[PDB]
Amino acid sequence: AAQTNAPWGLARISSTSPGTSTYYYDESAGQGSCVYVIDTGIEASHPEFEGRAQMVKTYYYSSRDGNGHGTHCAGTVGSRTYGVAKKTQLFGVKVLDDNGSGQYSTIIAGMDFVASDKNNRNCPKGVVASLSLGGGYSSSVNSAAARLQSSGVMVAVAAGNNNADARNYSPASEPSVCTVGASDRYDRRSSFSNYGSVLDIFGPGTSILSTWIGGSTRSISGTSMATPHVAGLAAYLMTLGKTTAASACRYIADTANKGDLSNIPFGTVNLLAYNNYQA
Ligand SMILES: [Ca+2]
């Protein structure tokens, strides 16, 4: 399949080089997979989700996304126009309030929720979780992410937006999950992107168009935006078979565009998420 005039990040994920604008992908499009977006929620009624999104959990007085961040991330995973895996099922877990804040205890509860909740969902091709959030190093937060991964969920987490070594942030610093840095449309490391040995992969993160609340769209930037490209890619690859939750981060790294990004600090992987789709 070919989507013309796609957001640059989608085109990038299916290209051996930067500067094209058509997204190419296998028509299966993540059908039969599921992605949990653990964030401020998802506006499930957005036409871009086509009934494939739903809220499954909140820790606040509402499950509504009153921020937009979660809706944007979900859009990059699986919206019809702005998404990587255009046929995946999207499950919203609201661990962040409408200001985008959340206590680590609530975030941990959300991760353990997903590890159990997947047993209440139909995801024959596999389960992914996208965590576009983080804070300072916490062994408890890292351990929760590790449990989620161990339970059979492909966990993708944002590296963070501090232009610093991600070793000092959680869940970014958890070795067993897939830690995602951000790049721009000219294949530069995004200026805010964290880096370091704990990173596994980079994805498009600067000026990313996606869904927003009130049935709208907007372009924003962050490792928060890179993460759902990788989460969607994992879901897509899992329905193709290609890989599994336990192996998807390694597979994505194995098949990535290599050595193409600029301003990657010595010691950080130079790997850009790539679907290796041959039309
Ligand atoms: Ca990691």
How far is the centre of ligand 1, averaged over its atoms, from the C-alpha of 175 (Å)? Answer: 4
Technique employed here was X-ray
Alpha helices per DSSP H over the chain: 8-13, 69-78, 104-117, 139-150, 223-239, 248-255
How far is the centre of ligand 1, averaged over its atoms, from the C-alpha of 174 (Å)? Answer: 5
Nearest C-alpha neighbor of 263 from the set 206, 210, 179, 178: 206
The reply to whether 177 sits in an annotated binding site is: yes
The reply to whether 260 sits in an annotated binding site is: yes
Pairing of strands 89-94, 135-136: unpaired
CB 169 within 8 A of CB 162: yes
Q: What is the C-alpha to C-alpha distance for residues 48 and 111, in angstroms, rounded to an integer?
A: 26
Q: Which residues contact 208 (CB under 8 A, 6 or more apart)?
A: 7, 9, 72, 76, 219, 220, 221, 225
Identify the architecture of domain 1-279 in CATH: 3-Layer(aba) Sandwich (3.40)
* DSSP labels, 182-215: EE-TTSBBPTT--BSTT--EEEE-SSEEEEETTT
How far is the centre of ligand 1, averaged over its atoms, from the C-alpha of 216 (Å)? Answer: 33
Enumerate the active-site residues.
39, 69, 224
Q: What is the C-alpha to C-alpha distance for residues 183 and 204, in angstroms, rounded to an integer?
A: 5
Please report the resolution in angstroms.
1.0
CB 78 within 8 A of CB 48: no
Largest CA distance in the chain: 46
How far is the centre of ligand 1, averaged over its atoms, from the C-alpha of 2 (Å)? Answer: 32
Q: What is the C-alpha to C-alpha distance for residues 11 and 24, in angstroms, rounded to an integer?
A: 7
How many CB atoms are closer than 10 A to CB 5? 9
113: left (phi over 0), alpha (psi -120 to 50) or beta: alpha
The reply to whether 265 sits in an annotated binding site is: no
The reply to whether 175 sits in an annotated binding site is: yes
How far is the centre of ligand 1, averaged over its atoms, from the C-alpha of 266 (Å)? Answer: 17
Angle between helices 69-78 and 223-239 (to 10 degrees): 30
CB 21 within 8 A of CB 99: no
Q: Which residues contact 152 (CB under 8 A, 6 or more apart)?
A: 118, 127, 245, 246
